[PDB]
């Protein structure tokens, strides 16, 4: 029944996180080294279904088709005009599974501020940090344990 | 009958908690160590079904189609106009199983305030702490037993 | 017949309590120890069935379609206008088995006030104590028997 | 025939009492000891069947559809307006077997007032004592026999 | 069912990234050397479906077909004209899978500013950096590990 329509979304969300983690590991491994960093990510998405239909008009450019006028003097002023305007019709079907938010957190074993800024700048391209969706990207250094 | 439509939600909710716990363990294990921390999470969700239909209009941009006027002087002032406006139709089907609230609690075996703040900042990205849904995230340190 | 529609709810309610007790035990066991605490929980739920249908209108943004006017002077002032407004239709089906109230009671074998407050703060995240549903959470220390 | 529709309720009521007694025993046994307390509970419930249908309106936000006016001076003042309002329809089916009242009585073998208050506070969470349904919870200490 | 309509998009997006990475590697390998650089890319795309229908008119060039006039003097001035205008009809079906954004990040093992600018200029042609889609291209040099 419907028990399979949600678990598929659950596995898809997990697969996205796994791919993002794999992409993250490829960049930080040769620069920081093995076992000198930890990172985890998560993605939240929605599976709604939206259909849109739009019909627009242009009132600034009217075109006349039939026109009748009467200008009786002595004072009758009668006018009857027909107009035809531009018509635009649009039909749109949205996607299902758009990414809503994305959070990335990176911890580096103990670094000055310049190196942290450089690492953040490098990771920005690798991740796709975008402010429109309210994504969060944090990178920081702490002392590990032995 | 309907006895299977709720137990599926119960197993799905448990599976979400298990995955979140597994993600939590991966980050805190190498930094804090084995047996130096405990953490548990819970998620509350709803399984409603909402359908939406919207029809919008634009009254600020009217377009004229037929127009008749009479300006008899001597004083008859008659007007008859027909208008056509923009039409927009939208149909939306919402998802079933959206997350409502999320609570995370972390206890660390005995730490200064800076380390606690750093750990909270690290866990924020790993969990997905969001203030819009009223999620709760608490991290603190207590003395364990022997 | 209908003798099975209520016993299923009875087993579901018992299963929820068992899972909550298991979650409680996992956190308090390593911090307090074996046999130094007791705790029990209960959950009350309802199994009603509610369907909702809503139809909303926007009276602040009217759009004119047909308009006729007469401004006879000498003083006839006649007007006839047709309007079209935004229409919104919503249909909602609620869930069956929502949690109404939740009570948790914890007794610790003999503790200062700070440790009690810390334990309560830890258990708040583990349980999901929410004031909207009027949930109750009590933690206290008493002297056991030998 | 109908001889089975009531005995099922009788066994369900007995099963609820048995489960509540089992939950009570689990908490008081390690704190008070074996054979130092006695307790019994009862639950009263109803098995009615109620269906509800509601139709609500919003008179404070009317929307105009058709309007005709006449303001003849010399003094005829005629108006004809049509309105459309928000419509809400709800259908609800209640549950069968809601708990009406609940009484708990606890006797402890001979205790100061503080210990009695602490025991009552512990049992409140374990039972679910609620004042809305007029539930009764009594705990007291008497001298047993030998 | 629909579980295959999204995984295909997931593999297509991964294939685009793989091809872009392969193109990147071909240029930077002979100039920088083996193991002296790291780079990763990502592409975000949408899979909507848009159909467009347009009907345009030219009101500045009207052509007369039938004309009747009356210029009675003594003063009746009556005119009745019919017009025919240019008509244009367009139907368009958009593509599915257009690229929305593109981010590239390059790190070079430790370089002056001139060499960095030259490398960025070289990579601009190889990637296709375009400001219309808000693409991001970052190139920088950091100290690696040993």
PDB file of N, CA, C and O in Angstrom, chain D residues 35-92:
ATOM      1  N   UNK D  35       5.425  -7.534  51.238  1.00  0.00           N
ATOM      2  CA  UNK D  35       4.459  -7.721  52.301  1.00  0.00           C
ATOM      3  C   UNK D  35       4.270  -6.549  53.235  1.00  0.00           C
ATOM      4  O   UNK D  35       3.673  -6.723  54.303  1.00  0.00           O
ATOM      5  N   UNK D  36       4.756  -5.362  52.877  1.00  0.00           N
ATOM      6  CA  UNK D  36       4.619  -4.180  53.716  1.00  0.00           C
ATOM      7  C   UNK D  36       3.578  -3.201  53.190  1.00  0.00           C
ATOM      8  O   UNK D  36       3.483  -2.080  53.701  1.00  0.00           O
ATOM      9  N   UNK D  37       2.797  -3.590  52.185  1.00  0.00           N
ATOM     10  CA  UNK D  37       1.822  -2.686  51.594  1.00  0.00           C
ATOM     11  C   UNK D  37       0.730  -3.499  50.914  1.00  0.00           C
ATOM     12  O   UNK D  37       0.934  -4.654  50.535  1.00  0.00           O
ATOM     13  N   UNK D  38      -0.436  -2.871  50.767  1.00  0.00           N
ATOM     14  CA  UNK D  38      -1.541  -3.423  50.000  1.00  0.00           C
ATOM     15  C   UNK D  38      -2.186  -2.303  49.196  1.00  0.00           C
ATOM     16  O   UNK D  38      -2.248  -1.157  49.646  1.00  0.00           O
ATOM     17  N   UNK D  39      -2.669  -2.643  48.004  1.00  0.00           N
ATOM     18  CA  UNK D  39      -3.271  -1.642  47.135  1.00  0.00           C
ATOM     19  C   UNK D  39      -4.237  -2.314  46.172  1.00  0.00           C
ATOM     20  O   UNK D  39      -4.003  -3.439  45.718  1.00  0.00           O
ATOM     21  N   UNK D  40      -5.324  -1.608  45.867  1.00  0.00           N
ATOM     22  CA  UNK D  40      -6.301  -2.054  44.886  1.00  0.00           C
ATOM     23  C   UNK D  40      -6.847  -0.840  44.150  1.00  0.00           C
ATOM     24  O   UNK D  40      -6.900   0.263  44.700  1.00  0.00           O
ATOM     25  N   UNK D  41      -7.251  -1.054  42.896  1.00  0.00           N
ATOM     26  CA  UNK D  41      -7.743   0.011  42.031  1.00  0.00           C
ATOM     27  C   UNK D  41      -9.014  -0.454  41.334  1.00  0.00           C
ATOM     28  O   UNK D  41      -9.310  -1.648  41.255  1.00  0.00           O
ATOM     29  N   UNK D  42      -9.778   0.517  40.834  1.00  0.00           N
ATOM     30  CA  UNK D  42     -10.931   0.234  39.993  1.00  0.00           C
ATOM     31  C   UNK D  42     -11.091   1.339  38.956  1.00  0.00           C
ATOM     32  O   UNK D  42     -10.647   2.470  39.166  1.00  0.00           O
ATOM     33  N   UNK D  43     -11.693   0.990  37.820  1.00  0.00           N
ATOM     34  CA  UNK D  43     -11.942   1.924  36.728  1.00  0.00           C
ATOM     35  C   UNK D  43     -13.380   1.757  36.260  1.00  0.00           C
ATOM     36  O   UNK D  43     -13.853   0.629  36.084  1.00  0.00           O
ATOM     37  N   UNK D  44     -14.073   2.875  36.068  1.00  0.00           N
ATOM     38  CA  UNK D  44     -15.427   2.896  35.536  1.00  0.00           C
ATOM     39  C   UNK D  44     -15.415   3.585  34.178  1.00  0.00           C
ATOM     40  O   UNK D  44     -14.852   4.674  34.037  1.00  0.00           O
ATOM     41  N   UNK D  45     -16.034   2.951  33.185  1.00  0.00           N
ATOM     42  CA  UNK D  45     -16.032   3.446  31.818  1.00  0.00           C
ATOM     43  C   UNK D  45     -17.431   3.353  31.229  1.00  0.00           C
ATOM     44  O   UNK D  45     -18.316   2.681  31.765  1.00  0.00           O
ATOM     45  N   UNK D  46     -17.624   4.042  30.105  1.00  0.00           N
ATOM     46  CA  UNK D  46     -18.890   4.046  29.387  1.00  0.00           C
ATOM     47  C   UNK D  46     -18.654   3.629  27.942  1.00  0.00           C
ATOM     48  O   UNK D  46     -17.573   3.836  27.387  1.00  0.00           O
ATOM     49  N   UNK D  47     -19.682   3.039  27.337  1.00  0.00           N
ATOM     50  CA  UNK D  47     -19.599   2.485  25.989  1.00  0.00           C
ATOM     51  C   UNK D  47     -20.701   3.058  25.105  1.00  0.00           C
ATOM     52  O   UNK D  47     -21.384   2.340  24.372  1.00  0.00           O
ATOM     53  N   UNK D  48     -20.884   4.373  25.165  1.00  0.00           N
ATOM     54  CA  UNK D  48     -21.858   5.040  24.319  1.00  0.00           C
ATOM     55  C   UNK D  48     -21.291   5.231  22.913  1.00  0.00           C
ATOM     56  O   UNK D  48     -20.145   4.882  22.623  1.00  0.00           O
ATOM     57  N   UNK D  49     -22.105   5.798  22.024  1.00  0.00           N
ATOM     58  CA  UNK D  49     -21.689   6.038  20.645  1.00  0.00           C
ATOM     59  C   UNK D  49     -22.253   7.382  20.214  1.00  0.00           C
ATOM     60  O   UNK D  49     -23.469   7.523  20.060  1.00  0.00           O
ATOM     61  N   UNK D  50     -21.375   8.362  20.012  1.00  0.00           N
ATOM     62  CA  UNK D  50     -21.768   9.732  19.710  1.00  0.00           C
ATOM     63  C   UNK D  50     -21.179  10.129  18.363  1.00  0.00           C
ATOM     64  O   UNK D  50     -19.990   9.910  18.111  1.00  0.00           O
ATOM     65  N   UNK D  51     -22.015  10.706  17.502  1.00  0.00           N
ATOM     66  CA  UNK D  51     -21.591  11.265  16.227  1.00  0.00           C
ATOM     67  C   UNK D  51     -21.968  12.739  16.183  1.00  0.00           C
ATOM     68  O   UNK D  51     -23.059  13.120  16.615  1.00  0.00           O
ATOM     69  N   UNK D  52     -21.065  13.565  15.660  1.00  0.00           N
ATOM     70  CA  UNK D  52     -21.231  15.010  15.683  1.00  0.00           C
ATOM     71  C   UNK D  52     -21.040  15.576  14.285  1.00  0.00           C
ATOM     72  O   UNK D  52     -20.136  15.159  13.555  1.00  0.00           O
ATOM     73  N   UNK D  53     -21.896  16.527  13.914  1.00  0.00           N
ATOM     74  CA  UNK D  53     -21.774  17.239  12.646  1.00  0.00           C
ATOM     75  C   UNK D  53     -21.943  18.724  12.916  1.00  0.00           C
ATOM     76  O   UNK D  53     -22.955  19.140  13.487  1.00  0.00           O
ATOM     77  N   UNK D  54     -20.959  19.520  12.506  1.00  0.00           N
ATOM     78  CA  UNK D  54     -20.933  20.950  12.774  1.00  0.00           C
ATOM     79  C   UNK D  54     -20.792  21.729  11.475  1.00  0.00           C
ATOM     80  O   UNK D  54     -20.048  21.326  10.575  1.00  0.00           O
ATOM     81  N   UNK D  55     -21.511  22.847  11.385  1.00  0.00           N
ATOM     82  CA  UNK D  55     -21.424  23.763  10.253  1.00  0.00           C
ATOM     83  C   UNK D  55     -21.351  25.180  10.806  1.00  0.00           C
ATOM     84  O   UNK D  55     -22.322  25.672  11.388  1.00  0.00           O
ATOM     85  N   UNK D  56     -20.207  25.832  10.631  1.00  0.00           N
ATOM     86  CA  UNK D  56     -19.945  27.142  11.205  1.00  0.00           C
ATOM     87  C   UNK D  56     -19.855  28.193  10.100  1.00  0.00           C
ATOM     88  O   UNK D  56     -19.555  27.892   8.941  1.00  0.00           O
ATOM     89  N   UNK D  57     -20.121  29.442  10.477  1.00  0.00           N
ATOM     90  CA  UNK D  57     -20.088  30.565   9.551  1.00  0.00           C
ATOM     91  C   UNK D  57     -19.316  31.705  10.199  1.00  0.00           C
ATOM     92  O   UNK D  57     -19.196  31.782  11.424  1.00  0.00           O
ATOM     93  N   UNK D  58     -18.788  32.593   9.359  1.00  0.00           N
ATOM     94  CA  UNK D  58     -18.053  33.770   9.824  1.00  0.00           C
ATOM     95  C   UNK D  58     -18.783  35.029   9.383  1.00  0.00           C
ATOM     96  O   UNK D  58     -18.628  35.469   8.229  1.00  0.00           O
ATOM     97  N   UNK D  59     -19.585  35.649  10.254  1.00  0.00           N
ATOM     98  CA  UNK D  59     -20.354  36.831   9.844  1.00  0.00           C
ATOM     99  C   UNK D  59     -19.567  38.132   9.858  1.00  0.00           C
ATOM    100  O   UNK D  59     -20.061  39.135   9.325  1.00  0.00           O
ATOM    101  N   UNK D  60     -18.370  38.155  10.446  1.00  0.00           N
ATOM    102  CA  UNK D  60     -17.609  39.392  10.557  1.00  0.00           C
ATOM    103  C   UNK D  60     -16.845  39.748   9.288  1.00  0.00           C
ATOM    104  O   UNK D  60     -16.379  40.885   9.170  1.00  0.00           O
ATOM    105  N   UNK D  61     -16.705  38.818   8.344  1.00  0.00           N
ATOM    106  CA  UNK D  61     -15.950  39.044   7.109  1.00  0.00           C
ATOM    107  C   UNK D  61     -16.829  38.696   5.914  1.00  0.00           C
ATOM    108  O   UNK D  61     -16.668  37.632   5.301  1.00  0.00           O
ATOM    109  N   UNK D  62     -17.766  39.568   5.554  1.00  0.00           N
ATOM    110  CA  UNK D  62     -18.590  39.326   4.369  1.00  0.00           C
ATOM    111  C   UNK D  62     -17.940  39.850   3.098  1.00  0.00           C
ATOM    112  O   UNK D  62     -17.235  40.861   3.091  1.00  0.00           O
ATOM    113  N   UNK D  63     -18.193  39.134   2.006  1.00  0.00           N
ATOM    114  CA  UNK D  63     -17.660  39.475   0.695  1.00  0.00           C
ATOM    115  C   UNK D  63     -18.812  39.723  -0.267  1.00  0.00           C
ATOM    116  O   UNK D  63     -19.727  38.900  -0.368  1.00  0.00           O
ATOM    117  N   UNK D  64     -18.763  40.851  -0.968  1.00  0.00           N
ATOM    118  CA  UNK D  64     -19.835  41.227  -1.879  1.00  0.00           C
ATOM    119  C   UNK D  64     -19.597  40.643  -3.264  1.00  0.00           C
ATOM    120  O   UNK D  64     -18.468  40.619  -3.759  1.00  0.00           O
ATOM    121  N   UNK D  65     -20.674  40.167  -3.887  1.00  0.00           N
ATOM    122  CA  UNK D  65     -20.625  39.603  -5.229  1.00  0.00           C
ATOM    123  C   UNK D  65     -21.365  40.454  -6.249  1.00  0.00           C
ATOM    124  O   UNK D  65     -20.790  40.833  -7.273  1.00  0.00           O
ATOM    125  N   UNK D  66     -22.633  40.767  -5.992  1.00  0.00           N
ATOM    126  CA  UNK D  66     -23.429  41.616  -6.866  1.00  0.00           C
ATOM    127  C   UNK D  66     -23.991  42.773  -6.058  1.00  0.00           C
ATOM    128  O   UNK D  66     -24.398  42.597  -4.905  1.00  0.00           O
ATOM    129  N   UNK D  67     -24.010  43.957  -6.667  1.00  0.00           N
ATOM    130  CA  UNK D  67     -24.446  45.164  -5.978  1.00  0.00           C
ATOM    131  C   UNK D  67     -25.183  46.068  -6.954  1.00  0.00           C
ATOM    132  O   UNK D  67     -24.688  46.331  -8.054  1.00  0.00           O
ATOM    133  N   UNK D  68     -26.359  46.538  -6.546  1.00  0.00           N
ATOM    134  CA  UNK D  68     -27.135  47.492  -7.324  1.00  0.00           C
ATOM    135  C   UNK D  68     -27.588  48.609  -6.397  1.00  0.00           C
ATOM    136  O   UNK D  68     -28.019  48.351  -5.270  1.00  0.00           O
ATOM    137  N   UNK D  69     -27.489  49.848  -6.873  1.00  0.00           N
ATOM    138  CA  UNK D  69     -27.799  51.007  -6.051  1.00  0.00           C
ATOM    139  C   UNK D  69     -28.585  52.028  -6.862  1.00  0.00           C
ATOM    140  O   UNK D  69     -28.463  52.103  -8.086  1.00  0.00           O
ATOM    141  N   UNK D  70     -29.398  52.812  -6.157  1.00  0.00           N
ATOM    142  CA  UNK D  70     -30.159  53.904  -6.751  1.00  0.00           C
ATOM    143  C   UNK D  70     -30.276  55.014  -5.721  1.00  0.00           C
ATOM    144  O   UNK D  70     -30.735  54.773  -4.599  1.00  0.00           O
ATOM    145  N   UNK D  71     -29.875  56.224  -6.106  1.00  0.00           N
ATOM    146  CA  UNK D  71     -29.770  57.376  -5.216  1.00  0.00           C
ATOM    147  C   UNK D  71     -30.515  58.569  -5.803  1.00  0.00           C
ATOM    148  O   UNK D  71     -29.982  59.672  -5.933  1.00  0.00           O
ATOM    149  N   UNK D  72     -31.772  58.344  -6.184  1.00  0.00           N
ATOM    150  CA  UNK D  72     -32.570  59.383  -6.821  1.00  0.00           C
ATOM    151  C   UNK D  72     -32.785  60.548  -5.863  1.00  0.00           C
ATOM    152  O   UNK D  72     -33.258  60.360  -4.737  1.00  0.00           O
ATOM    153  N   UNK D  73     -32.443  61.749  -6.318  1.00  0.00           N
ATOM    154  CA  UNK D  73     -32.639  62.974  -5.562  1.00  0.00           C
ATOM    155  C   UNK D  73     -33.742  63.810  -6.207  1.00  0.00           C
ATOM    156  O   UNK D  73     -34.241  63.505  -7.291  1.00  0.00           O
ATOM    157  N   UNK D  74     -34.125  64.884  -5.524  1.00  0.00           N
ATOM    158  CA  UNK D  74     -35.137  65.796  -6.041  1.00  0.00           C
ATOM    159  C   UNK D  74     -35.044  67.161  -5.366  1.00  0.00           C
ATOM    160  O   UNK D  74     -35.836  68.061  -5.649  1.00  0.00           O
ATOM    161  N   UNK D  75     -36.853  61.406  -2.740  1.00  0.00           N
ATOM    162  CA  UNK D  75     -35.494  60.949  -2.483  1.00  0.00           C
ATOM    163  C   UNK D  75     -35.475  59.432  -2.339  1.00  0.00           C
ATOM    164  O   UNK D  75     -35.611  58.901  -1.236  1.00  0.00           O
ATOM    165  N   UNK D  76     -35.311  58.734  -3.460  1.00  0.00           N
ATOM    166  CA  UNK D  76     -35.301  57.278  -3.436  1.00  0.00           C
ATOM    167  C   UNK D  76     -33.899  56.756  -3.155  1.00  0.00           C
ATOM    168  O   UNK D  76     -32.940  57.099  -3.849  1.00  0.00           O
ATOM    169  N   UNK D  77     -33.786  55.912  -2.132  1.00  0.00           N
ATOM    170  CA  UNK D  77     -32.515  55.297  -1.761  1.00  0.00           C
ATOM    171  C   UNK D  77     -32.717  53.789  -1.730  1.00  0.00           C
ATOM    172  O   UNK D  77     -33.182  53.247  -0.723  1.00  0.00           O
ATOM    173  N   UNK D  78     -32.367  53.115  -2.822  1.00  0.00           N
ATOM    174  CA  UNK D  78     -32.556  51.675  -2.942  1.00  0.00           C
ATOM    175  C   UNK D  78     -31.208  50.982  -3.078  1.00  0.00           C
ATOM    176  O   UNK D  78     -30.309  51.481  -3.759  1.00  0.00           O
ATOM    177  N   UNK D  79     -31.077  49.831  -2.424  1.00  0.00           N
ATOM    178  CA  UNK D  79     -29.850  49.048  -2.472  1.00  0.00           C
ATOM    179  C   UNK D  79     -30.196  47.566  -2.489  1.00  0.00           C
ATOM    180  O   UNK D  79     -31.137  47.133  -1.820  1.00  0.00           O
ATOM    181  N   UNK D  80     -29.431  46.798  -3.260  1.00  0.00           N
ATOM    182  CA  UNK D  80     -29.610  45.349  -3.325  1.00  0.00           C
ATOM    183  C   UNK D  80     -28.231  44.720  -3.454  1.00  0.00           C
ATOM    184  O   UNK D  80     -27.556  44.914  -4.468  1.00  0.00           O
ATOM    185  N   UNK D  81     -27.814  43.971  -2.435  1.00  0.00           N
ATOM    186  CA  UNK D  81     -26.485  43.386  -2.397  1.00  0.00           C
ATOM    187  C   UNK D  81     -26.573  41.894  -2.118  1.00  0.00           C
ATOM    188  O   UNK D  81     -27.455  41.430  -1.391  1.00  0.00           O
ATOM    189  N   UNK D  82     -25.646  41.144  -2.709  1.00  0.00           N
ATOM    190  CA  UNK D  82     -25.514  39.713  -2.478  1.00  0.00           C
ATOM    191  C   UNK D  82     -24.169  39.432  -1.825  1.00  0.00           C
ATOM    192  O   UNK D  82     -23.154  40.032  -2.194  1.00  0.00           O
ATOM    193  N   UNK D  83     -24.163  38.516  -0.862  1.00  0.00           N
ATOM    194  CA  UNK D  83     -22.979  38.234  -0.062  1.00  0.00           C
ATOM    195  C   UNK D  83     -22.648  36.751  -0.113  1.00  0.00           C
ATOM    196  O   UNK D  83     -23.528  35.906  -0.291  1.00  0.00           O
ATOM    197  N   UNK D  84     -21.361  36.449   0.041  1.00  0.00           N
ATOM    198  CA  UNK D  84     -20.885  35.081   0.183  1.00  0.00           C
ATOM    199  C   UNK D  84     -19.912  35.024   1.350  1.00  0.00           C
ATOM    200  O   UNK D  84     -19.034  35.882   1.478  1.00  0.00           O
ATOM    201  N   UNK D  85     -20.072  34.012   2.197  1.00  0.00           N
ATOM    202  CA  UNK D  85     -19.361  33.927   3.463  1.00  0.00           C
ATOM    203  C   UNK D  85     -18.574  32.625   3.550  1.00  0.00           C
ATOM    204  O   UNK D  85     -18.780  31.687   2.776  1.00  0.00           O
ATOM    205  N   UNK D  86     -17.659  32.585   4.516  1.00  0.00           N
ATOM    206  CA  UNK D  86     -16.862  31.389   4.752  1.00  0.00           C
ATOM    207  C   UNK D  86     -17.737  30.260   5.277  1.00  0.00           C
ATOM    208  O   UNK D  86     -18.630  30.476   6.101  1.00  0.00           O
ATOM    209  N   UNK D  87     -17.477  29.048   4.798  1.00  0.00           N
ATOM    210  CA  UNK D  87     -18.224  27.865   5.199  1.00  0.00           C
ATOM    211  C   UNK D  87     -17.257  26.812   5.721  1.00  0.00           C
ATOM    212  O   UNK D  87     -16.237  26.531   5.083  1.00  0.00           O
ATOM    213  N   UNK D  88     -17.579  26.237   6.876  1.00  0.00           N
ATOM    214  CA  UNK D  88     -16.769  25.193   7.489  1.00  0.00           C
ATOM    215  C   UNK D  88     -17.671  24.041   7.898  1.00  0.00           C
ATOM    216  O   UNK D  88     -18.689  24.253   8.563  1.00  0.00           O
ATOM    217  N   UNK D  89     -17.298  22.826   7.502  1.00  0.00           N
ATOM    218  CA  UNK D  89     -18.070  21.625   7.798  1.00  0.00           C
ATOM    219  C   UNK D  89     -17.155  20.623   8.485  1.00  0.00           C
ATOM    220  O   UNK D  89     -16.045  20.362   8.009  1.00  0.00           O
ATOM    221  N   UNK D  90     -17.619  20.065   9.601  1.00  0.00           N
ATOM    222  CA  UNK D  90     -16.845  19.108  10.377  1.00  0.00           C
ATOM    223  C   UNK D  90     -17.713  17.911  10.733  1.00  0.00           C
ATOM    224  O   UNK D  90     -18.880  18.071  11.104  1.00  0.00           O
ATOM    225  N   UNK D  91     -17.138  16.716  10.622  1.00  0.00           N
ATOM    226  CA  UNK D  91     -17.808  15.478  11.002  1.00  0.00           C
ATOM    227  C   UNK D  91     -16.887  14.706  11.933  1.00  0.00           C
ATOM    228  O   UNK D  91     -15.717  14.487  11.605  1.00  0.00           O
ATOM    229  N   UNK D  92     -17.411  14.293  13.084  1.00  0.00           N
ATOM    230  CA  UNK D  92     -16.610  13.656  14.119  1.00  0.00           C
ATOM    231  C   UNK D  92     -17.309  12.408  14.635  1.00  0.00           C
ATOM    232  O   UNK D  92     -18.522  12.410  14.860  1.00  0.00           O
TER     233      UNK D  92
END
